[PDB]
Coordinates of C-alpha atoms and ligand atoms in Angstrom, one line a residue:
Chain A
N1 CA 1.9 -19.3 -3.1
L2 CA 3.8 -16.1 -3.3
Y3 CA 6.2 -18.9 -2.8
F4 CA 5.0 -20.6 -6.0
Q5 CA 4.9 -17.2 -7.9
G6 CA 8.4 -16.2 -7.0
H7 CA 9.7 -19.7 -8.0
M8 CA 7.8 -19.5 -11.3
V9 CA 9.1 -16.1 -12.1
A10 CA 12.7 -17.1 -11.2
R11 CA 12.4 -20.1 -13.5
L12 CA 11.2 -18.0 -16.4
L13 CA 14.1 -15.6 -15.9
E14 CA 16.6 -18.5 -15.6
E15 CA 15.4 -19.6 -19.1
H16 CA 16.4 -16.2 -20.3
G17 CA 19.9 -16.3 -18.9
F18 CA 19.4 -14.8 -15.4
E19 CA 20.9 -16.1 -12.2
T20 CA 18.2 -16.1 -9.5
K21 CA 17.5 -16.4 -5.8
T22 CA 14.0 -16.5 -4.3
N23 CA 12.4 -15.1 -1.1
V24 CA 15.4 -13.0 0.1
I25 CA 15.1 -10.7 3.1
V26 CA 17.8 -8.0 3.1
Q27 CA 18.6 -5.4 5.8
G28 CA 17.7 -2.2 4.1
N29 CA 19.2 1.3 4.9
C30 CA 16.2 1.6 7.3
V31 CA 14.5 -1.7 7.8
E32 CA 14.3 -5.3 6.6
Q33 CA 12.8 -5.7 3.2
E34 CA 11.5 -8.8 1.4
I35 CA 12.5 -9.3 -2.2
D36 CA 10.5 -12.0 -4.1
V37 CA 13.3 -12.6 -6.6
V38 CA 16.8 -11.3 -7.0
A39 CA 17.8 -11.7 -10.6
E40 CA 21.2 -10.9 -12.2
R41 CA 22.5 -11.0 -15.7
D42 CA 25.6 -9.5 -17.3
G43 CA 26.2 -7.1 -14.4
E44 CA 22.6 -5.9 -14.0
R45 CA 20.8 -6.9 -10.8
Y46 CA 17.0 -6.6 -10.3
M47 CA 14.9 -6.4 -7.2
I48 CA 11.7 -8.3 -8.2
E49 CA 8.4 -8.3 -6.4
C50 CA 5.4 -10.4 -7.5
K51 CA 1.9 -8.9 -7.0
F52 CA -0.5 -11.5 -8.3
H53 CA -4.3 -11.5 -8.0
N54 CA -6.9 -14.4 -8.2
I55 CA -9.6 -11.9 -9.4
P56 CA -9.5 -9.7 -12.5
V57 CA -8.2 -6.5 -10.8
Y58 CA -5.3 -4.2 -11.7
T59 CA -2.0 -3.8 -9.9
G60 CA -2.1 -0.1 -9.2
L61 CA -0.3 3.1 -8.4
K62 CA -0.1 2.5 -4.7
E63 CA 1.7 -0.9 -5.2
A64 CA 4.1 0.7 -7.7
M65 CA 5.0 3.6 -5.3
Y66 CA 5.5 1.1 -2.3
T67 CA 7.8 -0.9 -4.5
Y68 CA 9.8 2.2 -5.5
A69 CA 10.2 3.1 -1.8
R70 CA 11.4 -0.6 -1.2
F71 CA 13.9 -0.3 -4.0
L72 CA 15.3 3.0 -2.5
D73 CA 15.7 1.2 0.9
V74 CA 17.7 -1.8 -0.6
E75 CA 19.5 0.1 -3.4
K76 CA 22.8 0.3 -1.5
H77 CA 23.0 -3.5 -1.7
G78 CA 23.6 -3.2 -5.5
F79 CA 20.3 -3.1 -7.3
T80 CA 20.0 -1.7 -10.8
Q81 CA 16.2 -1.4 -11.0
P82 CA 13.1 -2.7 -9.3
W83 CA 10.8 -4.9 -11.4
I84 CA 7.2 -5.9 -10.7
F85 CA 5.5 -9.0 -12.1
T86 CA 1.8 -9.4 -12.0
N87 CA -0.5 -12.0 -13.5
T88 CA -3.2 -9.4 -14.4
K89 CA -2.5 -5.9 -15.7
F90 CA -1.0 -2.6 -14.4
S91 CA -3.3 0.4 -14.2
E92 CA -2.5 3.3 -16.6
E93 CA -1.4 5.3 -13.5
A94 CA 1.0 2.5 -12.4
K95 CA 2.4 2.3 -16.0
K96 CA 3.0 6.0 -16.1
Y97 CA 4.6 6.2 -12.7
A98 CA 6.8 3.2 -13.4
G99 CA 8.0 4.7 -16.7
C100 CA 8.8 7.9 -15.0
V101 CA 10.7 6.5 -12.0
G102 CA 12.3 3.5 -13.7
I103 CA 10.3 0.4 -12.5
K104 CA 10.3 -2.5 -15.0
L105 CA 6.9 -4.0 -15.3
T106 CA 5.8 -7.4 -16.6
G107 CA 2.1 -8.3 -16.6
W108 CA 0.2 -11.2 -18.2
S109 CA 0.2 -9.4 -21.5
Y110 CA 2.6 -6.4 -20.9
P111 CA 4.9 -5.2 -22.3
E112 CA 4.1 -6.1 -25.9
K113 CA 5.8 -9.4 -26.7
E114 CA 7.2 -9.9 -23.2
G115 CA 4.2 -10.7 -20.9
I116 CA 4.1 -13.8 -18.7
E117 CA 1.6 -15.4 -21.3
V118 CA 4.5 -15.2 -23.8
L119 CA 7.2 -16.3 -21.4
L120 CA 5.1 -19.5 -20.6
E121 CA 3.5 -20.2 -24.0
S122 CA 6.6 -19.6 -26.2
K123 CA 8.3 -22.6 -24.4
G124 CA 5.1 -24.6 -24.0
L125 CA 5.1 -24.4 -20.2
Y126 CA 2.2 -25.4 -17.9
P127 CA 2.4 -24.2 -14.2
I128 CA 1.7 -27.1 -11.8
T129 CA -1.2 -25.0 -10.3
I130 CA -3.2 -26.5 -13.2
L131 CA -3.1 -29.9 -11.5
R132 CA -5.7 -31.4 -9.2
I133 CA -3.3 -31.0 -6.1
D134 CA -3.7 -29.4 -2.7
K135 CA -1.5 -26.7 -1.1
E136 CA 0.6 -29.3 0.7
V137 CA 1.4 -31.4 -2.4
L138 CA 1.8 -28.1 -4.3
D139 CA 4.4 -26.7 -1.8
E140 CA 6.3 -30.0 -1.6
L141 CA 6.6 -29.9 -5.4
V142 CA 7.7 -26.2 -5.4
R143 CA 10.3 -26.7 -2.7
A144 CA 11.9 -29.4 -4.9
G145 CA 11.9 -26.7 -7.6
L146 CA 9.0 -28.4 -9.4
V147 CA 7.0 -25.5 -10.9
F148 CA 5.9 -26.8 -14.4
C149 CA 4.1 -30.1 -15.4
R150 CA 7.3 -31.1 -17.3
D151 CA 9.2 -30.9 -13.9
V152 CA 6.8 -33.5 -12.4
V153 CA 7.5 -35.8 -15.4
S154 CA 11.3 -35.4 -15.3
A155 CA 11.4 -35.7 -11.5
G156 CA 9.9 -39.2 -11.7
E157 CA 7.7 -41.1 -9.4
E158 CA 10.7 -42.2 -7.4
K159 CA 11.6 -38.5 -6.5
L160 CA 8.0 -37.5 -5.8
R161 CA 8.0 -40.2 -3.1
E162 CA 11.0 -38.6 -1.3
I163 CA 9.4 -35.2 -1.2
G164 CA 6.4 -36.7 0.5
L165 CA 3.9 -38.1 -1.9
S166 CA 2.4 -41.6 -1.5
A167 CA 3.3 -44.1 -4.3
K168 CA -0.4 -43.8 -5.5
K169 CA -0.4 -40.0 -5.4
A170 CA 2.9 -39.8 -7.2
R171 CA 1.5 -42.0 -10.0
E172 CA -1.6 -39.9 -10.2
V173 CA 0.2 -36.6 -10.4
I174 CA 2.6 -37.9 -13.1
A175 CA -0.3 -39.1 -15.1
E176 CA -2.1 -35.8 -14.7
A177 CA 1.0 -33.9 -15.8
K178 CA 1.4 -36.1 -18.9
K179 CA -2.2 -35.6 -19.8
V180 CA -1.9 -31.8 -19.6
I181 CA 1.3 -31.8 -21.7
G182 CA -0.2 -34.2 -24.4
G183 CA -3.7 -32.4 -24.4
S184 CA -2.8 -29.0 -25.8
Chain B
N1 CA -14.8 11.3 6.2
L2 CA -11.2 11.5 5.0
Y3 CA -12.9 14.8 4.4
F4 CA -13.7 15.2 8.1
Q5 CA -10.3 13.9 9.2
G6 CA -8.3 16.3 7.0
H7 CA -10.5 19.2 8.2
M8 CA -10.0 18.2 11.9
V9 CA -6.2 17.9 11.4
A10 CA -6.0 21.2 9.6
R11 CA -8.0 22.9 12.4
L12 CA -5.6 21.4 15.1
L13 CA -2.6 22.7 13.2
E14 CA -4.2 26.1 12.7
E15 CA -4.5 26.3 16.5
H16 CA -0.7 25.9 16.6
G17 CA 0.1 28.6 14.1
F18 CA 0.0 26.8 10.8
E19 CA -1.6 28.0 7.6
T20 CA -3.5 25.1 6.0
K21 CA -5.3 23.9 2.9
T22 CA -7.2 20.6 2.7
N23 CA -7.7 18.0 0.0
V24 CA -5.2 19.3 -2.5
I25 CA -4.3 17.4 -5.6
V26 CA -1.0 18.5 -7.1
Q27 CA 0.7 17.3 -10.4
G28 CA 3.7 15.4 -9.2
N29 CA 6.9 14.9 -11.1
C30 CA 5.3 11.7 -12.4
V31 CA 1.6 11.6 -11.7
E32 CA -1.2 13.5 -9.8
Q33 CA -1.0 13.1 -6.0
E34 CA -3.6 13.7 -3.3
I35 CA -2.4 15.6 -0.2
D36 CA -4.9 15.5 2.7
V37 CA -3.5 18.7 4.3
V38 CA -0.9 21.1 3.2
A39 CA 0.4 23.0 6.3
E40 CA 2.9 25.8 6.4
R41 CA 4.5 27.7 9.2
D42 CA 7.6 30.0 9.4
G43 CA 8.9 28.8 6.0
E44 CA 8.4 25.0 6.6
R45 CA 5.8 23.3 4.4
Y46 CA 4.4 19.8 5.2
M47 CA 2.7 17.2 3.0
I48 CA 0.2 15.7 5.4
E49 CA -1.7 12.4 4.9
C50 CA -4.3 11.0 7.2
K51 CA -4.5 7.2 7.6
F52 CA -7.3 6.7 10.2
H53 CA -8.9 3.3 11.2
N54 CA -12.3 2.5 12.8
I55 CA -10.9 -0.7 14.3
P56 CA -7.9 -1.0 16.6
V57 CA -5.2 -1.7 14.0
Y58 CA -1.8 -0.2 13.4
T59 CA -0.8 2.1 10.6
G60 CA 2.1 0.1 9.2
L61 CA 5.3 0.0 7.2
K62 CA 3.6 -0.3 3.8
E63 CA 1.6 3.0 4.4
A64 CA 4.8 4.8 5.6
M65 CA 6.8 3.7 2.5
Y66 CA 3.9 4.6 0.1
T67 CA 3.8 8.0 1.8
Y68 CA 7.5 8.5 1.4
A69 CA 7.2 7.7 -2.4
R70 CA 4.3 10.3 -2.6
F71 CA 6.5 12.9 -0.9
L72 CA 9.3 12.3 -3.4
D73 CA 6.9 12.8 -6.3
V74 CA 5.6 16.2 -5.0
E75 CA 8.8 17.4 -3.3
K76 CA 9.7 19.7 -6.2
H77 CA 6.5 21.8 -5.3
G78 CA 8.3 22.9 -2.2
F79 CA 7.7 20.4 0.6
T80 CA 9.9 20.2 3.6
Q81 CA 8.8 16.8 5.0
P82 CA 5.9 14.4 4.8
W83 CA 3.8 13.9 7.9
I84 CA 1.3 11.1 8.7
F85 CA -1.6 11.4 11.1
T86 CA -3.4 8.4 12.4
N87 CA -6.0 8.0 15.1
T88 CA -4.5 4.7 16.3
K89 CA -0.8 3.9 16.5
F90 CA 2.1 3.3 14.1
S91 CA 3.8 -0.1 14.1
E92 CA 7.4 -0.3 15.4
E93 CA 8.5 -0.9 11.8
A94 CA 6.7 2.2 10.6
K95 CA 8.2 4.3 13.5
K96 CA 11.7 3.0 12.6
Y97 CA 11.4 3.6 8.9
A98 CA 9.9 7.1 9.4
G99 CA 12.7 8.1 11.8
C100 CA 15.2 7.0 9.2
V101 CA 13.7 8.6 6.1
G102 CA 12.3 11.7 7.8
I103 CA 8.5 11.2 8.0
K104 CA 6.9 13.1 10.9
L105 CA 4.3 11.0 12.6
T106 CA 1.4 11.9 14.9
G107 CA -0.8 9.1 16.3
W108 CA -3.5 9.1 19.0
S109 CA -0.9 9.0 21.7
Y110 CA 2.4 9.5 19.7
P111 CA 4.8 11.2 20.0
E112 CA 4.9 11.7 23.7
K113 CA 3.1 14.9 24.6
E114 CA 2.0 15.6 21.0
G115 CA -0.6 13.0 20.1
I116 CA -4.1 13.8 18.7
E117 CA -5.5 13.0 22.2
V118 CA -3.4 15.9 23.6
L119 CA -4.1 18.2 20.7
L120 CA -7.9 17.8 21.3
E121 CA -8.0 17.4 25.1
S122 CA -5.6 20.2 25.9
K123 CA -8.1 22.7 24.3
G124 CA -11.2 20.8 25.5
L125 CA -12.3 20.0 21.9
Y126 CA -15.0 17.5 20.9
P127 CA -15.1 16.3 17.3
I128 CA -18.7 16.6 15.9
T129 CA -18.5 12.9 15.0
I130 CA -19.6 12.3 18.6
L131 CA -23.1 13.7 17.8
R132 CA -26.2 11.8 16.8
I133 CA -25.9 13.0 13.1
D134 CA -25.8 11.2 9.7
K135 CA -23.1 11.4 7.0
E136 CA -25.1 14.1 5.1
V137 CA -25.6 16.4 8.1
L138 CA -22.0 15.6 9.1
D139 CA -20.6 16.6 5.6
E140 CA -22.7 19.8 5.5
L141 CA -21.3 20.8 8.9
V142 CA -17.7 20.1 7.8
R143 CA -18.0 22.0 4.5
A144 CA -19.0 25.0 6.6
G145 CA -15.7 24.3 8.6
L146 CA -17.7 23.0 11.5
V147 CA -15.6 20.2 13.0
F148 CA -16.0 20.6 16.8
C149 CA -19.1 20.8 19.0
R150 CA -18.1 24.4 19.8
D151 CA -18.3 25.3 16.1
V152 CA -22.0 24.1 16.0
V153 CA -22.7 26.4 19.0
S154 CA -21.0 29.4 17.6
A155 CA -22.4 28.9 14.1
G156 CA -25.9 29.3 15.5
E157 CA -29.2 27.8 14.5
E158 CA -29.6 30.5 11.9
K159 CA -26.4 29.4 10.0
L160 CA -27.2 25.7 10.3
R161 CA -30.4 26.4 8.4
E162 CA -28.4 27.9 5.5
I163 CA -26.2 24.9 5.2
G164 CA -29.2 22.6 4.9
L165 CA -30.6 21.6 8.3
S166 CA -34.3 22.0 9.1
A167 CA -35.1 24.4 11.9
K168 CA -35.9 21.4 14.1
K169 CA -32.7 19.5 13.3
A170 CA -30.7 22.7 13.8
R171 CA -32.2 23.1 17.3
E172 CA -31.5 19.4 18.1
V173 CA -27.9 19.5 17.0
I174 CA -27.2 22.7 18.9
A175 CA -28.7 21.2 22.1
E176 CA -26.7 18.0 21.6
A177 CA -23.5 20.0 21.2
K178 CA -24.2 22.1 24.3
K179 CA -24.8 18.9 26.2
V180 CA -21.5 17.3 25.2
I181 CA -19.6 20.5 26.1
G182 CA -21.3 20.8 29.5
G183 CA -21.2 17.1 30.3
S184 CA -17.4 16.5 30.7
Ligands
LIG1 CL1 5.3 -28.0 -18.6
LIG2 CL1 -15.8 21.5 21.1

């Protein structure tokens, strides 16, 4: 589900004109480094890491500083800036450190006008995590690039069967996605 | 007890000709940073962090990379190199990253000939953590700079009373320390 997060983030950036690759390991100057999303547009290339939480806690200074060190180790591969996405908030210390070293930050509601809540809600997007589906079904959908309820609908029950859903489960998931989309 | 660790490490370095200060917060280029020990000798100045564990687990790459970022943020204050002490071992990834960015590492048994086990055992030192004492008694002793059993003995029951021990507890702790030292 860092797998889901990276795919959701790549998709949101693709909607804003970025070319993306997910879950990339590169050989750093020193050691191998995982990059959750590599995003490029108009000659800028970002090293993106997702740090999401399932409880209401901050992404803090230690995470920011780790991330900066990661960026330094991969920078020779042609990265403009590191960028952290979180689904909660950054601490004030993390915000300060980031502004001062040059880490872009996107939280649920940060920066003003550009948080994940805006990226999703401005397009009317609903992550498939809202659906009554298990981690297996979930992962199958994501691997097919299905990250939003709309993707389930436009994939179609035929395609959901290929990726591993029973006919019955495919019908149920499509109906659930339609209900979310029509129930706002 | 990061309080104890920093004091134990400073004392071991003082035995090897370093001038030390413990638990120092400095204003970094970006934000405040905690340094567990600042150690200097012959014009070299180290930023030391202790990462100890009470279970047999490695100090790993994330900790090393955090520490390197910390070093970069305080480096303008005149630090030669960062240095991590751990009471277990560093992972192979941490060792590799450290060698490649320039972080000194000292583990229980690393580097060869220079691990904490050697620093203690070569001088016949016994940390006071071996004694039947609580966190309060422990902290009192450490604040007085009492980190080894020998320090309890040379402090004397009179001094242990000043720092807060009852007469009875002072006698018991001295007897326990004598028993450790004579029981090797
Ligand atoms: Cl949707
Ligand atoms: Cl001793």
